[PDB]
Design an enzyme around this catalytic site. Structure first.
Site, PDB file in Angstrom:
ATOM      1  N   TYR A  79       0.837  -1.196   0.000  1.00 56.55           N
ATOM      2  CA  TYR A  79       0.000   0.000   0.000  1.00 56.55           C
ATOM      3  C   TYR A  79       0.876   1.252   0.000  1.00 56.55           C
ATOM      4  O   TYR A  79       0.933   1.991   0.981  1.00 56.55           O
ATOM      5  CB  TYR A  79      -0.901  -0.058   1.241  1.00 56.55           C
ATOM      6  CG  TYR A  79      -2.130   0.830   1.244  1.00 56.55           C
ATOM      7  CD1 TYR A  79      -2.546   1.509   0.099  1.00 56.55           C
ATOM      8  CD2 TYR A  79      -2.889   0.975   2.406  1.00 56.55           C
ATOM      9  CE1 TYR A  79      -3.694   2.312   0.111  1.00 56.55           C
ATOM     10  CE2 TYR A  79      -4.035   1.775   2.429  1.00 56.55           C
ATOM     11  CZ  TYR A  79      -4.429   2.439   1.280  1.00 56.55           C
ATOM     12  OH  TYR A  79      -5.559   3.232   1.303  1.00 56.55           O
TER      13      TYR A  79
ATOM     14  N   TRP B 159       1.043  -4.854   5.503  1.00 58.37           N
ATOM     15  CA  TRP B 159       0.679  -6.264   5.481  1.00 58.37           C
ATOM     16  C   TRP B 159       1.891  -7.181   5.279  1.00 58.37           C
ATOM     17  O   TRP B 159       1.757  -8.342   4.878  1.00 58.37           O
ATOM     18  CB  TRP B 159      -0.413  -6.508   4.432  1.00 58.37           C
ATOM     19  CG  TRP B 159      -1.772  -6.067   4.936  1.00 58.37           C
ATOM     20  CD1 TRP B 159      -2.570  -6.728   5.834  1.00 58.37           C
ATOM     21  CD2 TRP B 159      -2.451  -4.841   4.630  1.00 58.37           C
ATOM     22  NE1 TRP B 159      -3.698  -5.987   6.105  1.00 58.37           N
ATOM     23  CE2 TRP B 159      -3.652  -4.826   5.381  1.00 58.37           C
ATOM     24  CE3 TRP B 159      -2.160  -3.753   3.798  1.00 58.37           C
ATOM     25  CZ2 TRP B 159      -4.561  -3.763   5.321  1.00 58.37           C
ATOM     26  CZ3 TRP B 159      -3.064  -2.695   3.739  1.00 58.37           C
ATOM     27  CH2 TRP B 159      -4.252  -2.709   4.497  1.00 58.37           C
TER      28      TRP B 159
ATOM     29  N   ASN C 263      -5.526  -5.616  12.343  1.00 55.29           N
ATOM     30  CA  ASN C 263      -5.682  -6.545  11.232  1.00 55.29           C
ATOM     31  C   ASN C 263      -4.372  -6.856  10.515  1.00 55.29           C
ATOM     32  O   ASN C 263      -4.177  -7.971  10.022  1.00 55.29           O
ATOM     33  CB  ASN C 263      -6.706  -6.008  10.227  1.00 55.29           C
ATOM     34  CG  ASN C 263      -8.093  -5.854  10.838  1.00 55.29           C
ATOM     35  OD1 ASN C 263      -8.393  -6.445  11.879  1.00 55.29           O
ATOM     36  ND2 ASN C 263      -8.947  -5.070  10.186  1.00 55.29           N
TER      37      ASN C 263
ATOM     38  N   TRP D 283       6.815   2.939  16.723  1.00 52.81           N
ATOM     39  CA  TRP D 283       8.240   3.111  16.978  1.00 52.81           C
ATOM     40  C   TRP D 283       8.404   3.818  18.321  1.00 52.81           C
ATOM     41  O   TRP D 283       9.465   3.754  18.940  1.00 52.81           O
ATOM     42  CB  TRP D 283       8.904   3.946  15.878  1.00 52.81           C
ATOM     43  CG  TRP D 283       8.209   5.242  15.594  1.00 52.81           C
ATOM     44  CD1 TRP D 283       7.241   5.466  14.659  1.00 52.81           C
ATOM     45  CD2 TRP D 283       8.417   6.493  16.262  1.00 52.81           C
ATOM     46  NE1 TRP D 283       6.832   6.777  14.699  1.00 52.81           N
ATOM     47  CE2 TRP D 283       7.538   7.432  15.674  1.00 52.81           C
ATOM     48  CE3 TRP D 283       9.259   6.914  17.300  1.00 52.81           C
ATOM     49  CZ2 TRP D 283       7.477   8.767  16.091  1.00 52.81           C
ATOM     50  CZ3 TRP D 283       9.199   8.245  17.714  1.00 52.81           C
ATOM     51  CH2 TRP D 283       8.314   9.154  17.108  1.00 52.81           C
TER      52      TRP D 283
ATOM     53  N   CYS E  66      -6.236  11.726  -5.534  1.00 55.81           N
ATOM     54  CA  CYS E  66      -4.799  11.702  -5.295  1.00 55.81           C
ATOM     55  C   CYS E  66      -4.026  11.501  -6.594  1.00 55.81           C
ATOM     56  O   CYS E  66      -2.969  12.098  -6.795  1.00 55.81           O
ATOM     57  CB  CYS E  66      -4.450  10.588  -4.304  1.00 55.81           C
ATOM     58  SG  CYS E  66      -4.975  10.931  -2.611  1.00 55.81           S
TER      59      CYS E  66
HETATM   60  C1  LIG Z   1      -2.226  17.259   3.766  1.00 53.89           C
HETATM   61  C2  LIG Z   1      -2.620  16.080   4.662  1.00 53.89           C
HETATM   62  C3  LIG Z   1      -1.979  14.788   4.142  1.00 53.89           C
HETATM   63  C4  LIG Z   1      -2.306  13.515   4.938  1.00 53.89           C
HETATM   64  C5  LIG Z   1      -1.577  12.352   4.249  1.00 53.89           C
HETATM   65  C6  LIG Z   1      -1.825  10.960   4.850  1.00 53.89           C
HETATM   66  C7  LIG Z   1      -1.031   9.996   3.956  1.00 53.89           C
HETATM   67  C8  LIG Z   1      -1.243   8.509   4.252  1.00 53.89           C
HETATM   68  C9  LIG Z   1      -0.429   7.699   3.219  1.00 53.89           C
HETATM   69  C10 LIG Z   1      -0.767   6.212   3.327  1.00 53.89           C
HETATM   70  N1  LIG Z   1      -0.292   5.181   2.291  1.00 53.89           N
HETATM   71  C11 LIG Z   1       1.203   4.989   2.347  1.00 53.89           C
HETATM   72  C12 LIG Z   1      -0.915   3.861   2.697  1.00 53.89           C
HETATM   73  C13 LIG Z   1      -0.620   5.481   0.819  1.00 53.89           C
HETATM   74  C14 LIG Z   1      -2.074   5.738   0.313  1.00 53.89           C
HETATM   75  C15 LIG Z   1      -2.215   6.372  -1.092  1.00 53.89           C
HETATM   76  C16 LIG Z   1      -1.637   7.784  -1.343  1.00 53.89           C
HETATM   77  C17 LIG Z   1      -2.340   8.893  -0.536  1.00 53.89           C
HETATM   78  C18 LIG Z   1      -1.776  10.291  -0.820  1.00 53.89           C
HETATM   79  C19 LIG Z   1      -2.525  11.347   0.004  1.00 53.89           C
HETATM   80  C20 LIG Z   1      -1.978  12.743  -0.337  1.00 53.89           C
HETATM   81  C21 LIG Z   1      -2.721  13.840   0.430  1.00 53.89           C
HETATM   82  C22 LIG Z   1      -2.143  15.195   0.022  1.00 53.89           C
END
Ligand SMILES: CCCCCCCCCC[N+](C)(C)CCCCCCCCCC
Ligand SMILES: Nc1ncnc2c1ncn2[C@@H]1O[C@H](CSCC[C@H](N)C(=O)O)[C@@H](O)[C@H]1O
EC number: 2.1.1.79
Length: 283
Positions: free
Chosen positions: A29, A71, A94, A119, A265
């Site tokens: 992911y 995962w 999970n 962490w 996204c």
């Molecule tokens: C501006 C606030 C941003 C919050 C970002 C939270 C990011 C969680 C990333 C989680 N994974 C690594 C699982 C990827 C999921 C797909 C890409 C998401 C990109 C979100 C961009 C938001 C600007």
């Protein structure tokens, strides 16, 4: 510092069965790496894993720490292809359970551990560190603490590959000759509120700062920006074709929300408002 189990779990403990509707079989992911043109999503995810692990100078016997193991695809690849022991951390119940089964069923002799902890609760020496797409959940307020711990747990020649999405400041974005803006900010609000509670994107200088201030030398910053729009396009294509299945396991409300998130996204990466980088942090 008590890990934000609730917020993180809000997203990943939704239902493995649901995520399986759009992620590749390894359940990776994060941004894939289309090294070659006609790579499948699975091949590109493996290539991304190899790109990250290939920067750590792994050796048999070493112990690799995967912060935000997900995962476990990365952990198991490290074991199976690189022959190192592993320790994976995750706040997802999970995911902890899923990886616990992978560990229990592995026929490989190396040591494998998965902990339902952050962490923030891990203080054990490791040889190398890898963290992909977990940083975005730490929060600007804990960045310094993370790099402090990372530097403390690594050997003298230790190395940490930090892979994280990076973002531009909405105010400064207007100067990048980038329209929308408001739309961007409005979408960010949507993501933090309905997809990733507590999420926060670090700017590149922010990562460079917390790394340097904690004793690290960033020897390389590699961008996978264009690769993420494709990864996201492939994730959304699958979810959509699995729409009927998505509603059954959850609700069409959850489906609609995830499609909006995945597709949105994808465009954000396509236009360049957000980036994703791998930082090679040398101790
Ligand atoms: C501006 C606030 C941003 C919050 C970002 C939270 C990011 C969680 C990333 C989680 N994974 C690594 C699982 C990827 C999921 C797909 C890409 C998401 C990109 C979100 C961009 C938001 C600007
Ligand atoms: N403070 C923290 N400590 C440890 N893991 C964390 C964390 N915040 C988020 N995570 C984990 O980081 C992951 C995101 C991403 C998954 C994987 N690296 C790929 O695929 C989740 O598994 C989440 O539980």
């Amino acid at each position: 510092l008590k890990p934000h189990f609730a917020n993180v779990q809000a997203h990943y403990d939704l239902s493995d069965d649901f995520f399986r509707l759009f992620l590749d079989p390894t359940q990776t992911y994060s941004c894939a790496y289309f090294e070659r043109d006609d790579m499948t999503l699975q091949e590109a995810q493996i290539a991304k894993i190899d790109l990250a692990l290939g920067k750590l100078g792994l050796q048999p016997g070493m112990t690799l720490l995967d912060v935000g193991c997900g995962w476990g695809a990365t952990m198991m690849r490290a074991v199976e292809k690189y022959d190192v022991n592993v320790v994976g951390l995750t706040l997802s119940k999970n995911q902890a359970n899923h990886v616990q089964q992978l560990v229990a069923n592995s026929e490989n002799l190396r040591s494998k551990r998965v902990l339902l902890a952050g962490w923030e609760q891990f203080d054990e020496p490791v040889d190398r560190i890898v963290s992909i797409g977990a940083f975005e959940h730490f929060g600007h307020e804990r960045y310094d603490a993370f790099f402090s711990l990372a530097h403390r747990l690594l050997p003298a020649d230790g190395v940490m590959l930090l892979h994280t999405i990076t973002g531009l400041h909405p105010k400064e974005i207007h100067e990048r000759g980038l329209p929308m803006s408001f739309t961007f900010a409005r979408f960010l609000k949507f993501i933090v509120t309905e997809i990733f509670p507590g999420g926060r994107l670090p700017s590149i200088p922010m990562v460079q700062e917390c790394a340097s201030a904690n004793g690290f030398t960033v020897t390389r910053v590699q961008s996978l920006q264009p690769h993420y729009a494709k990864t996201l396009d492939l994730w959304s294509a699958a979810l959509q074709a699995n729409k009927g299945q998505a509603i059954a396991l959850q609700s069409e409300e959850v489906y609609e929300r995830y499609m909006k998130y995945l597709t949105g996204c994808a465009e954000m990466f396509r236009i360049g408002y957000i980036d994703v980088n791998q930082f090679t942090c040398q101790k």
